[PDB]
Amino acid sequence: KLELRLKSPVGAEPAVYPWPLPVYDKHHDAAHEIIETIRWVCEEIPDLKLAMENYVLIDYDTKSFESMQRLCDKYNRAIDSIHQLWKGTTQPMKLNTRPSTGLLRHILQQVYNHSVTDPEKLNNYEPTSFDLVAQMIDEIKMTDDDLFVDLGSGVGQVVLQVAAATNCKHHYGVEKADIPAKYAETMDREFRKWMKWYGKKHAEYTLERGDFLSEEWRERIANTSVIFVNNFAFGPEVDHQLKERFANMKEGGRIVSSKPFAPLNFRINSRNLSDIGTIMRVVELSPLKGSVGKPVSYYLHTIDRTILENYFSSLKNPKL
Ligand SMILES: CC(C)N(C[C@H]1O[C@@H](n2cnc3c(N)ncnc32)[C@H](O)[C@@H]1O)[C@H]1C[C@@H](CCc2nc3cc(C(C)(C)C)ccc3[nH]2)C1
């Protein structure tokens, strides 16, 4: 049918690619997706690499189908070879694995390229976040008991990313507007599709329609251990409304944001006991060197009512 097919490394349904090979944006074509996909699978399987590298030269002219099929076939043949070896005394790769950071960037990238049909329909109302978000996840030091929500989910790329790098129960995304929430519906599928295509595990997640300020979410925000929220352009109305939901939150949970929900040099005194800063720490996170008003940093808030307790331990016994 004048097309290309890649064979899944765990005998899942192959990836179909129509010719000519679609270009998605100024820096992303499906041609390189392929090349990437291949060398990423070569990564999981040292054997496939062994069967490929010692023969392949990696590079081909992407303009020619006669040259792209040349590679795909080579790859597809190497796959069968390994699958045969999978019938021998040797074990296959462990199926219950999470993606390595490197791999996952590529995966989410595919999910974007394939689901975002019109890369302009949202980018008009919106203004690599991956590397950034990755940093935050190491900073969050997430434990198997936490719950995560992205407030204002968008198409939920982060929702997905957290779901693959951490290890917890149903993680959630909340999106009000129909457009990005609609894209999220197919973003759900492709992600789950490609994950199976690669044979990698991901925590349960759910990309939802709704407003986070609404009555129902008041409750849920309080139950959620980890909160990512990009609040750069939020405006005082909504900013205050969040602080109240964050108030109810359990002890020790975290909030990551572009803008601080509590001042940085916050000392507790007379006319500030009502303020949210009383129940949380706010340490500043330094930005990754390759990501973009140039001067920007980030803020990690941790629920700490010992901050408060100390002030009420101090009103008893003035040492000065
Ligand atoms: C500016 C943020 C909040 N957001 C805008 C979206 O918020 C949505 N939104 C507005 N108010 C809404 C409402 N009350 N309920 C439902 N959703 C609403 C709105 O529809 C819009 O699509 C965009 C971020 C993008 C989602 C992916 C994402 N990038 C993140 C970056 C970060 C950093 C800054 C800490 C690194 C953290 C989390 C991220 N998630 C969508």
From Swiss-Prot:
Residues holding S-adenosyl-L-methionine: 148-157, 175, 211-212
Location of the protein in the cell: Nucleus
Residues annotated with Phosphoserine modification: 286
Phenotypic consequence of residue 42 to G: Found in a patient with developmental delay and intellectual disability; uncertain significance
Domain DOT1: 13-316
Domain of life: Eukaryota
Effect of residue 97 to M: Found in a patient with developmental delay and intellectual disability; likely pathogenic
Assembly mode: Interacts with MLLT10.
Protein family: Belongs to the class I-like SAM-binding methyltransferase superfamily. DOT1 family.
Noted disease: Defects in DOTL1 are associated with an autosomal dominant form of global developmental delay and intellectual disability, with or without one or more major congenital anomalies. The patient phenotypes are characterized by central nervous system (CNS) dysfunction, such as mild motor delay and significant speech and language delay, and a range of congenital anomalies, including brain structural anomalies, cardiac defects, varied urogenital features and growth restriction. Variants may cause a gain-of-function effect leading to an increase in cellular H3K79 methylation levels.
Protein task: Histone methyltransferase. Methylates 'Lys-79' of histone H3. Nucleosomes are preferred as substrate compared to free histones. Binds to DNA.
Further details from the record: In contrast to other lysine histone methyltransferases, it does not contain a SET domain, suggesting the existence of another mechanism for methylation of lysine residues of histones.
UniProt protein name: Histone-lysine N-methyltransferase, H3 lysine-79 specific
Gene: DOT1L
Parent-record interval covered: 4 to 334 of 1537
